Symmetry: D2
Subunit: 313 residues, 4 copies
């Protein structure tokens, strides 16, 4: 009866028409969604019989065959992947094909994170085309393989969420223009690293548990899988932090394919994403595998931690 179904394709296509463009993005996101549906199906009967290597080979293949990319950066590949000339296009794509895959056995939410840049140079494609600021992303998002499979997409016009209807094998648009809440009730961080944190994070944790103005204390959640913690942060409001510890002095989370996508999504939904020292999106990278500290969330909460970072400075 739902004859007017807004699929992701119908959505992405109607928009690149306003860009007065060539169609490569619609083709790209199209291919990407073939990878996303196949990984979901795989995670759903994963047990009835690694997985993140299949995953990876599926995203690289659907992206080369789309004739819309030229440099592909993977979590799994040492170097950047340059698309053969016959299959080349203008977009650069950095992705993590199955984020949080250590946790596939404990059956909790995992996902694919991706960030798409445009190559702007006249030269032959290289990893340098990929070493751009995250503020330069044309589009970015993640797919979520939880109780339902969700693709959240951020572009210049906003943040939209599409859900996989498993009956038809199509992502359907279920929420338009997701704006995050100004202030939330949840803080998300691995507190098992408490001795390794700096003075400003420890002070912020302390007042969420023991509120200064004799208020109501913050709830705590940490799924242990970045996509699940950030999607909850977007839809429910709150703060999410994976700051620098001593196992990880530059942070644990990679910049081109975990911090920049999720930060692009957050800021487009009206939140902030910072390292405590600077905006994540404005960090200029040097190595495609470099890590970054990240504190992303509802504006008033991230701002709070930013001020605890200044007194301590």
């Amino acid at each position: 009866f739902d004859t007017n179904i807004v699929t992701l394709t119908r959505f992405v296509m109607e928009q690149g028409r306003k860009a007065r463009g060539t169609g490569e993005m619609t083709q790209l996101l199209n291919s990407l969604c073939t990878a996303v549906k196949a990984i979901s199906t795989a995670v759903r009967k994963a047990g009835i019989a690694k997985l993140d290597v299949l995953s990876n080979d599926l995203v690289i293949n659907v992206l080369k065959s789309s004739f819309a990319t030229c440099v592909l950066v993977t979590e799994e590949d040492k170097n950047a992947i340059i698309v053969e000339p016959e299959k080349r296009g203008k977009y650069v794509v950095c992705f993590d094909p199955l984020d949080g895959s250590s946790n596939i056995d404990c059956l909790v939410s995992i996902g694919t994170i991706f960030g798409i840049y445009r190559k702007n140079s006249t030269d032959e494609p290289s990893e340098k085309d990929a070493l751009q600021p995250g503020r330069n992303l044309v589009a970015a998002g993640y797919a979520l393989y939880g109780s339902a499979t969700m693709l959240v997409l951020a572009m210049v016009n906003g943040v939209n969420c599409f859900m996989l209807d498993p009956a038809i094998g199509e992502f359907i648009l279920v929420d338009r223009n997701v704006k995050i809440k100004k202030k939330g009730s949840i803080y998300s961080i691995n507190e098992g690293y408490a001795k390794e944190f700096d003075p400003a994070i420890t002070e912020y944790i302390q007042r969420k548990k023991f509120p200064p103005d004799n208020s109501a204390p913050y709830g705590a959640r940490y799924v242990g899988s970045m996509v699940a913690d950030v999607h909850r942060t977007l839809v429910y409001g709150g703060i999410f932090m994976y700051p620098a510890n001593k196992k990880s002095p530059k942070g644990k989370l990679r910049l081109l394919y975990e911090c920049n996508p999720m930060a692009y999504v957050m800021e487009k939904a009206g939140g902030l994403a910072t390292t405590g020292k600077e905006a994540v999106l404005d960090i200029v990278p040097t190595d495609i595998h470099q890590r970054a500290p990240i504190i992303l969330g509802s504006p008033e909460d991230v701002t709070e931690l930013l001020e605890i970072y200044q007194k301590h400075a």
Copy 2:
């Protein structure tokens, strides 16, 4: 593990690149497949609770939103449907959204038949753009909702069959360049109309049952649903006939959306399609709802009936 999956999109896109074109066909067939997956899902839980009217509204919508059509001809609509200017493209499409839908209750194979022309005039779109010879089709085919859902596609380069993988919601290419057999063993026709047939059909039926050279007699099958009878004829070889009776002097089957698609498919697979008087594809139409007699099948069998039509002439 199947990282290199040839989907219909990957197939259609790689080909329009050789046409040095604009992308409207890939978009069109893409939209069409959203309609096809949704109708399949519907026929699969059709009972757990008309259907061909939903079907129709689903194909018209996915085709308008593709920005690749301008005139749409339906079995269900009196007139041709002209696409609003903002959503217009170059292709004309004639379809039957759910062929053989009287038979949905008896649970047998049904399907969607479509034929795509190109508008070649400079004028504003009209039904006249649709009144072309079937020899002028750029592409044509059918989707089959039987035990599996099959989309058979014919274009200038050949006949290819793609199957719906229901796990991923993607049509996969399972047979490349289907050529029909020279001569087959099966004849397909509704013999309950036997008193109404002409002398040449009656003579051809007679020698399939009672072979002149003391041979082995032809088997007989007639599902009663054009898509199922023609797909069997393509994949197994044989003859299929719905010739003029007295309930139907111009035949029962419509020309722009049942006879021309199936004839385009047949001739591209190397078979023949005739009315007994002329090639179906070369019939120039006058009304978008006009019917035609059709005898389509393996070459040596159709040719046989063509000669029984000449002695009788």
Copy 3:
């Protein structure tokens, strides 16, 4: 989301609770449903992925694990299968695992036919337990892998249709206490064998194409798969006929697991099943793989052919 789902299990249990007899039967049919779902899925992705052998082995394994059978007859195995003493129960199941399996490649409907007897002896299970007349059948029916999957189940109360809801893997009751039309307008027979047809048949078909009482001729329909044509005959009406010719001298369809299951379905829905001479249900079997002619369908139609048999003898 229906909170009041009526599955095949809840159904059968609500008929057997008012009996104090078998919850052993619920176990058997329940097990038969797992195999039917596992075959349906395999047929639905068949081309993307011997089918009847793996189906044979699935129906035997799921049956032996019900703890409800002791003897099993299959189309594929020459001798009966006496189930292990440890896994025994009181029922004999006779099954054709994948009817019309030559018709799989052409995507025409296929199905699973099963008759279930009760072992009416104290002795050790032997194929003589399988050798009851169909009259002695406790439950019988079929599964049709069509545009939708349907399990039709005839027991002593009547016939009930169930449909596979692919979303949850359950057979849902969609038609209760089914009864066939007294008279239909379709006849189903392979007229390629017209030459070796006996004269009762030959006369009867001319009364269909050329009505004596000048009425409309019957429509012909022959899918070529027993389950598709016996199921169309049960819902629409009309006659289905596979009589004896010489190439198949005492008929083609096997008596224990194709003619008798269909004949018990037909008679518990008020239609008739004969061989032209006697009732199928009273023929006392001598080989497990013994054949028989079969004419079934609407009571006023079987009757009209039985009186042309009375005339030639």
Copy 4:
């Protein structure tokens, strides 16, 4: 296509056949599987389509139709439900239909918790039949709607995991006689309530973040859904803790259908379930909706917190 599928039904039946007891139990759990599949599907398309109310009604309808229950306790209904005399059997089922349902919107895992007692009386069913200590549980477990759907079922032999194969709608055995790690490296507790935590807890958490025996600190993990964290704790190891604070004075988790099902799973897999004072399984219930603290998980970890409880009393 596996011909030797081991479903939950074939499993349970192969353990109960070597017992001469219940095939009444197979009926119950079988019915519980229909509801679990019907809820899984609803959660998987949730956003595209009160969920816990329709889930409540589904678990009650499918349960009353098993002819295996007489008393039912639900999170949603204040009084027990004494099943009709016509539909009775010997088992009491206590169930939480949709655990952590506030977490549905954020797409984090949710689940169904069920404990099953046997009515140990001759009398008329009354909620006093529901009021056994968990020690008296015959079968207990949960369903996790995660990246995959899993039914974990603990009976007297041990714990077994089953996974929903979405293709055929059956739960397939994927792990046999499960046993938890003696000691894990993760602790799970909501530290937003750190202020009102009692001192055994507060000390124990500092031994996790700051190890006395200078070892690596434990990793924190808290999904916020009981089934996700009790299931991660069973497969990985570690401790899960919901102790009493004042806002929820005698603990938050309801004893009859959340603490006791989880506690019987944990103990039949060799882990421990306590309240800090006593074992959960021996607490004699007084209200059906009575609450309790719960600390569960690896034996060497519960032990380490039980000795800090011995210290403060």
